[PDB]
Amino acid sequence: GNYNYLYRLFRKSNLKPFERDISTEIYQAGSTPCNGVEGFNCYFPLQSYG
Amino acid sequence: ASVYAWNRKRISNCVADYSVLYNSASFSTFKCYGVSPTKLNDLCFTNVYA
Numbered sequence A: 001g002n003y004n005y006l007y008r009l010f011r012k013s014n015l016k017p018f019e020r021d022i023s024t025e026i027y028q029a030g031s032t033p034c035n036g037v038e039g040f041n042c043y044f045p046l047q048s049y050g
Numbered sequence B: 001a002s003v004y005a006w007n008r009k010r011i012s013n014c015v016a017d018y019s020v021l022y023n024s025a026s027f028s029t030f031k032c033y034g035v036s037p038t039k040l041n042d043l044c045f046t047n048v049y050a
Helices: B018-023
Strands: A006-008 A046-048
Touching: none
Parallel strands: none
Antiparallel strands: A006 A046
């Protein structure tokens, strides 16, 4: 498994053309705020291809 | 019901509030495979099999 290539699974909004997002901030996927901490409906935005 | 005789409920002719279902913290698994959880309140479907 080559897991070195990653894509942004989760983001709040669509990008502009020629816009790059490298910010590794947590995403809030539910009603509960995450406060930078993983948990229920709190996921890392960057997931790797298998 | 049991899993060999799973109960199928037909959800139709009604308006469905998926935000209450999605914001509930009792659910340990909420995984969608053909739609988005945040767009369930925006999309429309003919019927739902539960």
